[PDB]
């Protein structure tokens, strides 16, 4: 059973999620540009600033977001930006999106000044995620439920976020029975991988500082959402 409320809700989210595409002229740079450490970082920076914009536009459409406390609206974006960005790339690597150019994207990530410490677990995570064999609807809902985490730092009205989140967890919960009655513990596996995804918040802050002390800079938008000083 999937409630009618939950079917419309779900298709509405697929609207937002499908609508989130970044232009080809931008993503073609993953394949097109020279491969050197400096160009690799530049391109990752550019895919990221572009992606953040798309992120915001997706979050905006999330039902009831536009009627949240403004201060909390920001606390969520900053809170979820990394986790959401890691899921998007997980989808690219696992689903082999043409426009993601995954093999070349991996080459660029592997030579952009990131410590092995972080590369190893990052790719372990992507591998595990793929093994869940998630649909596009699941990637989409997880991103939605990640953005609307009520446990982020500096949220005032926690319960008001719970209310926006709980329905999406419910819909995902169902999809996990309905699109996989074979494996029972599928939904729980997803949630565990979310915990695993949380650990990348700390890695990413060290990644940023390493980059910065080696005189890389980001964009003003990234600098805001990632809190670069």
């Amino acid at each position: 059973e999937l409630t009618p409320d939950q079917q419309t809700l779900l298709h509405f989210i697929m609207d937002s999620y499908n609508k989130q595409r970044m232009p080809q002229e931008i993503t073609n740079k993953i394949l097109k540009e020279e491969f050197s450490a400096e160009e690799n970082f530049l391109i990752l920076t550019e895919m990221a600033t572009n992606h953040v914009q798309v992120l915001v536009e997706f979050t905006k459409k999330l039902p009831g977001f536009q009627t949240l406390d403004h201060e909390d609206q920001i606390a969520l974006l900053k809170g979820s930006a990394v986790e959401a960005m890691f899921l998007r790339s997980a989808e690219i690597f696992n689903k082999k999106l043409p426009s993601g150019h995954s093999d070349l994207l991996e080459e660029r990530i592997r030579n952009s000044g990131i410590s092995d410490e972080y590369i190893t677990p990052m790719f372990s995570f992507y591998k595990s995620i793929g093994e869940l064999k998630m649909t596009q609807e699941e990637y989409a809902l997880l991103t939605a439920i990640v953005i609307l985490s009520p446990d982020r730092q500096y949220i005032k009205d926690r319960e008001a976020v719970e209310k926006l989140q709980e329905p999406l967890l419910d819909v995902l919960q169902k999809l996990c029975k309905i699109h996989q009655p074979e494996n029972p513990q599928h939904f729980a596996e997803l949630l565990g991988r979310l915990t695993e995804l949380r650990t990348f918040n700390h890695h990413h802050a060290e990644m940023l500082m390493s980059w910065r002390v080696n005189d890389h800079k980001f964009t003003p938008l990234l600098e805001e959402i990632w809190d670069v000083q």
Binding site: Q53, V56, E57, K60, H70, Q73, I74, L77, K78, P220, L221, E224, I225, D227
Partner: peptide, 11 residues
Amino acid sequence: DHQLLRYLLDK
């Protein structure tokens, strides 16, 4: 902080 996030939120 906020400035550019705000700006994207309003559109």
